[PDB]
Amino acid sequence: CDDYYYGFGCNKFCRPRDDFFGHYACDQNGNKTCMEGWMGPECNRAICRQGCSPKHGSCKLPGDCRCQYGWQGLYCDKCIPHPGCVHGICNEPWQCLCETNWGGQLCDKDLNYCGTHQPCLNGGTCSNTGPDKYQCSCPEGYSGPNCEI
């Protein structure tokens, strides 16, 4: 057969290509086998990073994984939390689900301020009354919000 022609009657044509339309090499049989990182019948479809999200990841060039907006990571499977979420995580993009004991919007206000700071002086007992809020119970002879006379 002449160059690039294959088969018994030299009818099957195959010539290696490396452009936008296809990325392939030719077999002993003149079959269209794709180059490394490319797939599909025309070899113009890029193979993504193995494990790239089928829901939030994409391809233009192998072996990349470009993220859908709101998603991050190597596989684009991790959500981007609402900036700036402090003591919290996300399940969906732009979420800020708080931890214990934390609140509320950005998960930065302490729900256990008494256990973290202990602001009541002179033998005062305190209880948590909300995010970044506390209440001191003062003994006899001591006044003020923190029992500081």
Side-chain angles (χ1 to χ4, degrees), residues 72 79-100 102-109:
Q72 67 183 144
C79 46
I80 299 166
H82 186 276
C85 194
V86 188
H87 291 96
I89 53 161
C90 64
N91 299 328
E92 297 296 318
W94 320 112
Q95 284 181 341
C96 185
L97 275 73
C98 290
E99 293 172 17
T100 50
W102 291 98
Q105 192 184 330
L106 297 164
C107 306
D108 54 344
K109 303 167 188 178

Side-chain angles (χ1 to χ4, degrees), residues 86-88 96-119 126-135:
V86 188
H87 291 96
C96 185
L97 275 73
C98 290
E99 293 172 17
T100 50
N101 302 53
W102 291 98
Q105 192 184 330
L106 297 164
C107 306
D108 54 344
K109 303 167 188 178
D110 193 14
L111 298 174
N112 199 354
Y113 195 92
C114 271
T116 315
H117 294 88
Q118 288 186 318
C126 74
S127 53
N128 299 300
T129 53
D132 287 342
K133 291 171 184 176
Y134 64 94
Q135 176 199 309

